[PDB]
Ligand binder design. Structure first.
Ligand SMILES: Cc1cc2nc3c(=O)[nH]c(=O)nc-3n(C[C@H](O)[C@H](O)[C@H](O)COP(=O)(O)O)c2cc1C
Ligand SMILES: Cc1cc2nc3c(=O)[nH]c(=O)nc-3n(C[C@H](O)[C@H](O)[C@H](O)COP(=O)(O)O)c2cc1C
Ligand SMILES: Cc1cc2nc3c(=O)[nH]c(=O)nc-3n(C[C@H](O)[C@H](O)[C@H](O)COP(=O)(O)O)c2cc1C
Ligand SMILES: Cc1cc2nc3c(=O)[nH]c(=O)nc-3n(C[C@H](O)[C@H](O)[C@H](O)COP(=O)(O)O)c2cc1C
Ligand SMILES: O=C(O)C(=O)Cc1ccccc1
Ligand SMILES: O=C(O)C(=O)Cc1ccccc1
Ligand SMILES: O=C(O)C(=O)Cc1ccccc1
Ligand SMILES: O=C(O)C(=O)Cc1ccccc1
Lengths: 334, 334, 334, 334
C-alpha cells in the first residue's frame, strides 16, 4: 500500500542502482532550479470555497480533442527501460487503463509504433534533428501510428550539465537503446515546419517567458508546457509554476497552458489548476512507480493521484476542473 | 505547575497511546496547513500602546447573547473519551467553571443532553446528515437541551486524508461510540434549512474565502469561524489567520468573526483580536490538558490562558477586548 | 583580548550562575520578541558612500544639553550587583571614563546618590510608584544629585512573564537590595506630573506606536526610546528597529529618538543611525562585560564599541553621526 | 577533473595552511556581507528565452578598447605568492592564455612590470598613497608598462576588521613582500588627479550608492565596479548584485558597469549580465585554482567558467552577451 507519492520514491531508491537513481533524480548545475520547483509549490496556498454542490464531482477534462480522466499526462522521460525491463510499455499500459495521456519520447527505449499499439491517448515528444527532413519523418511516423499531439521540446538546444552523471561517469547500459533510430537546436522556423506538416496540435514544451508564450500562440501552437525541464536544463531558470499565472493571462485562452515540475500530489495538481493550468505533466514519480513495481506500480500511482485530485477538488468546493481554475490562491512563507 | 501551553503537550504525549496522540496532533496530506497555522501566527507582531488607563482591565466579551469570561471558546473535537475516561463531561465542567463556552460535537462520546446538563454556555456543532429531517432533529435536540448557538461545520463534505491514521491503522476503540446516535455534503440550501428551523444564532465554521464570508452574512449567519479545520481538511488550504483581516473588513460588522488554528497562548489570542477577531476557538491544547489531568487539567489550562490574555492585553495598553481589536500589527520574518 | 561583543557573552556565561545568566539573557513568553530584535537588525543592510572627506571623523553627538563620545548610552538594567560585587559603581565609572551616559535605575543595587557621585553623565530611569508624591520624590532626588535626564519607562504597567525565571524559581539573593528604598501603571497624566515637576528633559522609554511617539512630543517629552524592553515585556511586540524609521518621520525633529534592543556591534549602531536614531541604548552586553571583568571589562567593551563605530562610520563615508543618519538602507533576507 | 568551482575550494582548503585559507576566505565583522553576496545571487532566477538562432554563440565582449573572451576579469587580490610560489605570474599567464583581463594589484607580490611583461590584457588596481605624487607615479608606471585601465579602489579609506586574521594572529610571511615598493583615504579630488594624469580609462571599484555611480560618470570614470569588496570592508554593506539593476538604470550607458562578489559559476555570470552588468570580476575562486594547481589550475578554472558561461547563455537563448543583458529575472525565496 502507498498513501503518498513519497512512499514510491523510497521504494524506487531501494531497488535502483545508485547511478540510475541519480540520472532520474538529478538536475543541472547546483540543482537550484530542481529544488525551486518544490519550494515554489510549497509556497502556494489555496483559498477553498464551501457549501457548493458536489453531487457529480468529476476530474475529467477535454484536451486536444479527447477526454482525459484527470488534468494530467505522463511527461516525456527518455529511456524507460533503465527503470524496469518492460519500460515504456508498462507505463503506457497503466496510463491507458487510467485514462491518462502518455507522452512517447523521441529517445524511447521501445519503438514509438510498439508503444502506440498499446492504445490509449499517446502523444509524441519531438527533439529536433539536424536534418529537417528526418525531423518531419519522426513526426509523420507518430501521426501514422495514431499519436494525437506533437509535444515539441523547445528548451534543449543541447543538454544541460548533469553533475551527478559526470561524477558517476554515467552511461547508457548496452541493453538500452534509442529504439526509434544527430540533434540540432530548434528555432521558430522549426516550429513552423512542424506546424505545416501535421494536422495534429503542436505543443511547445519548455516555455517560461511571457513573450514566448504569446509568440507560441501567434505561431499556431495548440498548447504550451510552462516548464524548466525538471531543473535539468538551465540551472537558475525560474520554476514554471512561478510564471504560470502571468502566462495564462497573456495568452487569453489562445492555447492550452500546461505546467510541470515537482507535481507530487493531488493537492499540487489543484494548486496548478488554481494558478490557471489546463493540466499538468508528471515525470519522476511515474518512474519511481515503474521502478518499484512495473505496470502495477504505475497503476497504483495513478489510482492514488486520481483519489488525491478528487479529494482536493471536493474539499475546495470544485465540482469540475473549470471550477478549480477559478479558485484564488495566496503565497505564504516556507 | 504549567507555565505555558507547551508544558501540557509534553504531558499529553507521555500519557496517551501513540496512535491516539497521532489522531489528535495530525493533519491531512503533508501537514502543510497544520504547520502553516503556526507559522502564520509567529509572523504577526503587535504594535502595543502605552500609558493608557488599566484600572479595570477586563477580558470579557458579549457574544451570541451572553457574557463570556475570555474571547475564547473550546473548539468542537470529536470523541473526547479517547483522551480521558470522563471525556466531554470533564471538559464541559472546566469550561463552565472558567466562564468559557464549550462546543458540544455531533460526534461526542457522551450524549449532547448529558453534556448540556453540566450547565455553562454550551454551543452545539452540527455535521450535516444525509437526511435533512434527521439533521434538523439534532438541531432541535440541541436547542431543547439549552445550547445557545449552532456551529455548522461547512468544510467537511467528507473527511480529509489523515496519513498518520492510515499508517497507524487507527480505528475507534470499542469503548468509544458516537453517543448522539450517515453524513452528506452541506450546501447553502442546508444552511437555509437550519436557519429556518431555529431561533439560535447559526455560526458557519470553516470559511476562508472573502465571498463566502459575505454570503454567510447574506444567508443570515450570526457568525463565522475563519478556519482551515486545524490543517485536517484540505492540505494546502490557507490559514484562517491569513484571511481574517480581509474577511473582517468585508463583513463590516454584519456577523461575529471568530478564528481558529494554532492558538497556543494569550499572546496568540491578542494577535487574533488585533487582526479583528471577535473571539478564538482552541482545540488541541484543551485535549492535551484533558489527557494530562482530566477536569483539573482543563481548569489549569483555562486559568493559564486567562492570565496570559490579561497580561498581553495590559502590556499592549488595552483595558478591553474592543481596544485590542483596534491595535495595529506588522508582519515579520520567521 | 576581546574582538567582538560575542566574546564577552561567552566569558559571562562561564562565570555567572545559571539562574543569574538566565535572568539577564531571557525574555517573556516564547522569547519571540527577544529573537526578533536580532533578526530585524540582521535584515538591514547599509548603502555606504565613498570618496568623502574623512580627515576629522568624529563619533560625538550632543544630546540633552551635553556632548557624548558615541551615539550610545548604557541602558537601565536593574540590580547590577547580581553580576559583579561592585555592580553599578563599576559600570558608571567605566561609562564616565568613556564619555558615555549611564542610566541609573530606580531598582539600582547601589543608591542613586552614590552612583551619581561617580560623575560623568548620569541619567535616571523612573518606574512609577503607586504614590504620585513618592514618584516625584525620586525624580527630585535624581535632579538634586546631578542627573541630567529622566528616562521614564512607560512599557511596564507590570512585569512580563519571564518563563526562565519561573522555571528556575529565581529570586533576588539576600545580598542584593533595591538601594533607593509599591509600583503602579503609569499614564499620560503621570508623564505630565513628572514634566511639571522637573526642568530636566523627560525621555519616554518603551514607545512603539507612531501615534504614541507623536503624543510624546505633544506631551513635552525631550526624547523617546523606541523599544520592546529587550523582549522582556509583551511577547510578540514588534522590535523597535522595525518602527524606528516611521517614528522618526512622524516626529519631524520634535524630540530625540533613541532605539534599543539587540545592539551588538558598531555596525549595529550604524544601522540604527542610518534608520534615523539619535543614539542607541545597550543593555545585556554591558552586563556581560561587568560579569566577566568588572570595571575594566566594561571599559574594554566601550573601547571596542568606540573602535567599531568609528570603523563603520568611516567605511560608510560618514565624518559625523549626522552624515550617518542620511545614509540609505536596504532590507535583505536572513 | 573539476566540474564546478566548488571542487576547487575543497582542493585549496586541503593544501593551504589554515591561516592563509582564512585570510583568503574571510570577511569583516560577523561576515554578514560575505554571506549576503551568495544569498543574493541564489535568490535571482533567470527567465530564459527559447527558439532563437544559436548558430554563432559567442561569449566575447569589447571593454575599455579591447576584446575579451568572456564577460569576466580576474579581480585584484593582494599578495598572490601567499597561495603558490609563482603567485601573480601563474595567474596572469593563465588569464592571458584564456583571453581574460588580469588586474595587477598595488600590493602585488611580484612587481607590476614583471606581471605586465607576461602580456595579455593587464589592468592595474590603485590604492591611494598618502602622497599624491607617489600615487600618480604608480599610475604612470602602470601606463608605461602597458596596463590598459586603472582600477581605482574607492572603498578602502582603511582596511576592514578581519576577525579571522585577528584571532589567528595572521601576518605576512617574510618571503612575501609588496614588490611594487603609506596609504591614505581617497576622495573625489584624488579621482580627478588620476583622471587628469592618464589617458587610460579610470574604473572606480567599490561603488554601491546610486548617486555615487552617477557622480562617477560625471567625474569622467570609464567604468565602475559595483562591489562590497567581497564582504571584507563594511560588515553590513549591501551586496553589489542587489544595487546593480538600479545603478545600471541611473548611469544610462554613461560608463561600463561591472559587478563582483560571490560569482561561482557561469550561471552566476548570466545572472549578473541579466541584471545589467557589462562584466564581472572573480576573486576567491581564482586563488583556489592557483593554490590547488598553479598556472594549470587557473587555466582549468577559466576553461570551466568559459564552458559554463557558453552553456548558460545558449540554454537561455542568448547568442551574445548583449542578448543576455536583455533577459528578465525574477526573485525567489532561498
Ligand atoms: C530522467 C528524465 C528524462 C527526461 N527526458 C525528457 C525527454 O526526453 N524529453 C523531454 O521533453 N523532457 C524530458 N524530461 C523532462 C520531463 O518531461 C519533465 O519536464 C520533468 O521531469 C517534469 O518534472 P517532474 O519530474 O518534477 O515531474 C526528462 C526528465 C527526467 C527526470
Ligand atoms: C482530534 C480533532 C477532532 C476534531 N473534530 C472536529 C469535529 O468533530 N467538528 C469540527 O467542526 N471540528 C473538529 N475539529 C477541528 C477543531 O474544531 C479546530 O478547528 C481545530 O482543532 C482548531 O485548531 P487547534 O487544534 O489548532 O486549536 C477537530 C480537531 C481535532 C484535532
Ligand atoms: C536584566 C535586565 C534588567 C532590566 N531592567 C530594566 C529596568 O530596571 N528599567 C528599564 O527601563 N529597563 C530595564 N531593562 C531593559 C533595558 O533597559 C533594555 O531596554 C534592553 O535590555 C535593551 O536591549 P539589549 O539588552 O538587547 O541591549 C532590563 C533589561 C535586562 C536584560
Ligand atoms: C584575499 C583577498 C585580497 C584582496 N585584495 C584586494 C586588493 O588588494 N585590492 C582590491 O581592490 N580588492 C581586493 N580584494 C577584493 C576583490 O578584488 C573582490 O572585490 C572580492 O574578492 C570579489 O569577490 P569574490 O572573491 O567573492 O569573487 C581582495 C579580496 C581577497 C579575498
Ligand atoms: O530531457 C532530459 O532531461 C533527458 O534527460 C533526455 C535525455 C536523456 C538521455 C540523453 C539525452 C537526453
Ligand atoms: O473534524 C475532524 O477533524 C474530526 O476529526 C472529526 C471526526 C472524527 C472522527 C471521525 C470522523 C470525523
Ligand atoms: O525591566 C526589566 O526587564 C527588569 O528586569 C526590571 C526588574 C528587575 C527585577 C524585578 C522587577 C523589575
Ligand atoms: O583589499 C583587501 O581585502 C585586501 O585584503 C588587500 C590587503 C591585503 C593585505 C594587507 C592590506 C590590504
Amino acid at each position: 500500500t502507498y498513501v503518498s507519492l513519497a512512499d514510491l520514491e523510497r521504494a524506487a531508491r531501494d531497488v535502483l542502482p545508485g547511478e540510475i537513481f541519480d540520472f532520474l533524480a538529478g538536475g543541472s548545475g547546483t540543482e537550484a532550479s530542481l529544488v525551486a520547483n518544490r519550494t515554489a509549490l510549497e509556497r502556494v496556498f489555496v483559498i477553498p470555497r464551501m457549501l457548493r454542490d458536489l453531487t457529480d464531482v468529476t476530474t475529467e477534462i477535454d484536451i486536444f480533442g479527447r477526454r482525459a480522466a484527470l488534468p494530467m499526462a505522463v511527461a516525456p522521460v527518455a529511456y524507460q527501460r533503465l527503470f524496469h525491463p518492460e519500460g515504456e510499455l508498462a507505463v503506457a499500459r497503466a496510463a491507458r487503463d487510467a485514462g491518462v495521456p502518455y507522452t512517447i519520447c523521441t529517445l524511447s527505449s521501445v519503438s514509438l509504433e510498439e508503444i502506440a499499439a498499446v492504445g490509449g491517448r499517446p502523444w509524441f515528444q519531438l527533439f529536433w534533428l539536424r536534418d529537417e527532413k528526418r525531423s518531419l519523418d519522426l513526426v509523420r511516423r507518430a501521426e501514422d501510428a495514431g499519436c494525437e499531439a506533437i509535444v515539441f521540446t523547445v528548451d534543449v538546444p543541447w543538454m544541460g550539465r548533469r553533475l551527478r552523471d559526470m561524477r558517476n561517469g554515467f552511461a547508457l547500459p548496452e541493453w538500452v537503446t534509442a529504439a526509434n533510430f544527430e540533434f540540432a537546436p530548434a528555432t521558430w522556423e522549426s516550429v513552423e515546419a512542424v506546424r505545416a506538416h501535421t494536422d495534429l496540435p503542436v505543443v511547445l514544451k519548455g516555455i517560461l517567458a511571457v513573450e514566448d508564450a504569446r509568440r507560441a500562440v501567434d505561431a499556431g501552437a495548440g498548447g504550451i508546457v510552462v516548464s524548466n525541464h525538471g531543473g535539468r536544463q538551465l540551472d537558475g531558470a525560474v520554476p514554471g509554476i512561478e510564471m504560470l499565472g502571468e502566462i495564462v493571462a497573456a495568452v487569453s485562452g489562445g492555447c492550452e497552458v500546461l505546467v510541470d515540475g515537482g507535481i507530487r500530489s493531488g493537492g499540487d495538481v489543484l494548486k496548478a489548476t488554481a494558478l490557471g493550468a489546463s493540466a499538468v505533466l508528471v515525470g519522476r514519480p511515474v518512474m519511481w512507480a515503474l521502478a518499484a513495481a512495473g505496470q502495477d506500480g504505475v497503476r497504483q500511482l495513478l489510482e492514488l493521484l486520481a483519489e488525491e485530485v478528487r479529494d482536493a477538488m471536493g474539499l475546495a468546493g470544485c465540482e469540475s476542473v473549470g471550477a478549480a481554475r477559478r479558485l484564488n490562491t495566496k503565497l505564504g512563507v516556507v
